[PDB]
């Protein structure tokens, strides 16, 4: 029905501003809804930031005291968030979300966009293949992996065989240390299938415009 999609820069320097866009499809922004911005911090903490409604009337949380502007462009069917004077405490996942003005119904949220407030430098990841030890390849299943190391900011995307290999996958939350992230992913397949059916981890890091497609080669002759 109505669909919302956030866009905007994912890395902001302290004391500058965050600027996000919500593009609404399937519904006119000049009808029926309140168009909200909501952000999520660690520990399941959600904060309502404000809305602009279908008539262009706005409201925002006093917690954001004068730092926030919510606007719209009806010719583009978009509404916007500007949050100035950011600090690291503004690092969060930002969502747009429409709720009906009349009753709070039909809540529809975007996918969310992570905004990191940091002075640290954008860094492309190194993508390393994790090939099983010989001793662990003689059973019915075999587990392979990929290590995505040394990148900043989040996120990356990781798939296996371009998304065609999706079952048996565990992609773990990244760990941050010294302003760099590391993430790993495992994939488990039937052992007799490998290495006859190749397995490749596809990593993308939009912030550095980098993609890596790493084929997992067996240890031992290749």
């Amino acid at each position: 029905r109505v669909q919302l999609q956030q866009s905007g820069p994912g890395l902001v320097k302290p004391s500058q501003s965050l600027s996000l866009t919500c593009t609404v499809t399937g519904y006119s922004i000049t009808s029926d809804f309140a168009w909200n911005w909501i952000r999520q911090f660690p520990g399941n903490k959600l904060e309502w930031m404000g809305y602009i409604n279908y008539s262009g009337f706005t409201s925002h949380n006093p917690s954001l005291k004068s730092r926030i502007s919510i606007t719209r462009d009806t010719s583009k069917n978009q509404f916007f968030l500007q949050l100035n004077s950011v600090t690291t405490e503004d690092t969060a996942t930002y969502y747009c979300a429409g709720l009906l003005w009349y009753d709070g119904g039909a809540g529809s949220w975007g996918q969310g966009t992570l905004v990191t407030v940091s002075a640290a430098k954008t860094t492309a990841p190194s993508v390393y293949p994790l090939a099983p030890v010989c001793g662990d390849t003689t059973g019915s299943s075999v587990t392979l992996g990929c290590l995505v190391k040394g990148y900043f900011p989040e996120p990356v995307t990781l798939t296996w065989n371009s998304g065609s290999l999706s079952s048996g996958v565990h992609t773990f939350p990244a760990v941050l240390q010294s302003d760099l992230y590391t993430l790993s992913s495992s994939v488990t397949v039937t052992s007799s299938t490998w290495p006859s059916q190749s397995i490749t981890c596809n990593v993308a890091h939009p912030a550095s415009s980098t993609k890596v497609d790493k084929k997992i080669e067996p240890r031992g002759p290749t």
Binding site: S126, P132, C134, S141, G145, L147, H170, V175, G220
Partner: protein, 219 residues
Amino acid sequence: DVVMTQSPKTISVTIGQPASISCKSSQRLLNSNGKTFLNWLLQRPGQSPKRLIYLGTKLDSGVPDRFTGSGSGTDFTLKISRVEAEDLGVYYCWQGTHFPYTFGGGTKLEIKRADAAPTVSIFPPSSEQLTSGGASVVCFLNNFYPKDINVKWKIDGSERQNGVLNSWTDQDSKDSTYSMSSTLTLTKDEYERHNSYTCEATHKTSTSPIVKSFNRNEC
């Protein structure tokens, strides 16, 4: 501002059994036109929050009728008549009656299942990484239940507690298990100086650790 207090913080429920969650508001949520702007939402792992209940007691659009919202005034309840594994995640309440609008702190629903030992796999540093001066040893502890687990690393048979970083997945609704990754990072020179690397998983499923090892420079 209105405080929204949810309880319990977490619940663990077997598939097919009921669940009930409470949300209590610091101020009445009834409005001057007889509406109560109290919503319930579910946030599944890696997703945005999604609608469940609105107007205190009404099923929101497209939501399965297994969910029921009840209450009035300051005290509200969400019931799930029979839990399904895809129900796992964090339930929130939200109020829209008093500015500024506020959310409860969330209640995490876990699916209770039979215990399952982890599948443990260890991985040496890639040749690619070794050309760079660092060396990461990775161990995966996959598809276990319940969620608590311990990992111990050893180098040449001696415990190594320095340079280990762990990461845990959310519960999987496909099988209601958990997974964990543990990464031991060393310099390349320190890695190339030792021979055997071991990761040991200790899980309630057995008093015996699951041990996986390799020797550097052996396949």
